[PDB]
Write a protein that binds this ligand. Structure first.
Ligand SMILES: Cc1cn([C@H]2C[C@H](O)[C@@H](COP(=O)(O)NP(=O)(O)OP(=O)(O)O)O2)c(=O)[nH]c1=O
Ligand SMILES: [Mn+2]
Ligand SMILES: [Mn+2]
Ligand code: NA
Ligand code: NA
Length: 324
DNA sequence: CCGACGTCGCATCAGC
DNA sequence: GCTGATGCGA
DNA sequence: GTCGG
């Protein structure tokens, strides 16, 4: 919060670029700038000072100058009172409503949650779920609830077939005190690259049967996106509904998957950079050697996370030490 | 100057 | 009905 | 919007 006013500003600008102007690369630019400023251990005195940071250029330096001198940005203040733009930006907070749908809604006079509630038949299945759990989906999940959620998922998975391997990844696996969602990775010895596709279905079905999974956003043969909720403790207040994903991955690509979806974002980029250095290319699925001309060879056998590290001469890093 | 900038599974649309 | 495009989330 | 080939 050292430069909180600046990073709040850049984040708000980022959102209007994505949701209103539909300029995804400007969105990412503003977030890159906000992130590098968020890490900078001094209170910024000038735009010139900030411009030394990678990701902060001429225009943002100009904006920072205006903010420091006046306490605001004229453009941002203006788009804030724009009823059309502020409404488009807001509606995209509904899961399933992106920039395109939000624009169409506002175009025909639908600008609020209240308006969405009045117009169910113009909402697809995902958008209806996003509306129903609008509040819940914006809450974070305390680690304690995540632990209880993990208890349920690992138990039910093993109950379906004890040969399943399941891992809760993401921020939880890195040991975070709270999480945005629950990322579950699943594999099974009978599922390889060279291979039934009811393997995901039976796990989803069992979680529905014990009433853990409450809604489905999408479900194919390899990826489930949905909603879950912990059971209510006696006559206590109900737990918020939570977002849960389940990914079914071939055995031979499982740990490349666990690595990637454990993160963090930044650790992943660093690791992949070091791999090219050492002559390897790592994606979410595999690790392949690069020839002298840059030609990628066959995927290398991986039977653990650590295997990936050994391939690239890196010593195993604990998930709790993967913030970068 | 001017193109890159993460990527891909699933739901649903657009065209035929 | 089928194929490819588009929107969306993360 | 920022970067860099
Ligand atoms: C979206 C995204 C995902 N990942 C792979 C690694 C992210 O850390 C990770 C898990 O994704 P997540 O749930 O979007 N992020 P998180 O679990 O670290 O954070 P949170 O608990 O959802 O807030 O998956 C990336 O490497 N880059 C990304 O941009
Ligand atoms: Mn997550
Ligand atoms: Mn996630
Ligand atoms: Na800079
Ligand atoms: Na949305």
């Amino acid at each position: 919060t050292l430069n909180g006013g600046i990073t709040d500003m850049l984040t708000e600008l980022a959102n209007f670029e994505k949701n209103v102007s539909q300029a995804i690369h400007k969105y990412n630019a503003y977030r890159k700038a906000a992130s590098v400023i968020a890490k900078y251990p001094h209170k910024i005195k000038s735009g010139a000072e900030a411009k030394k940071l990678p990701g902060v250029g001429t225009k943002i330096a100009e904006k920072i100058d205006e903010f420091l001198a006046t306490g605001k940005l004229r453009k941002l203040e203006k788009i804030r009172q724009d009823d059309t733009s502020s409404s488009i930006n807001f509606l995209t907070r509904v899961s399933g409503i992106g920039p395109s749908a939000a624009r169409k809604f506002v175009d025909e006079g639908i600008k609020t949650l209240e308006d969405l509630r009045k117009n169910e038949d113009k909402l697809n299945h995902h958008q209806r779920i996003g509306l129903k759990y609008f509040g819940d989906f914006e809450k974070r999940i305390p680690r304690e609830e995540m632990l209880q959620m993990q208890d349920i998922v690992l138990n039910e998975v093993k109950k379906v077939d004890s040969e399943y391997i399941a891992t809760v990844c993401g921020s939880f696996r890195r040991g975070a005190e709270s999480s945005g969602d629950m990322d579950v990775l699943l594999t099974h010895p009978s599922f390889t690259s060279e291979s039934q596709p009811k393997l995901l279905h039976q796990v989803v079905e069992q979680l529905q049967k014990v009433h853990f999974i409450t809604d489905t956003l999408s479900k194919g043969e390899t990826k489930f996106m949905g909603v879950c909720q912990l059971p209510s403790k006696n006559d206590e207040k109900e737990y918020p509904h939570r977002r849960i994903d389940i990914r079914l991955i071939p055995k031979d690509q499982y740990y490349c998957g666990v690595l990637y979806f454990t993160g963090s974002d930044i650790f992943n980029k660093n690791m992949r950079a070091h791999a090219l250095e050492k002559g390897f290319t790592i994606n979410e699925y595999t690790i392949r050697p690069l020839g002298v001309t840059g030609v990628a060879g066959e995927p290398l056998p991986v039977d653990s996370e650590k295997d990936i590290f050994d391939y690239i001469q890196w010593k195993y890093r604990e998930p709790k030490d993967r913030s970068e």
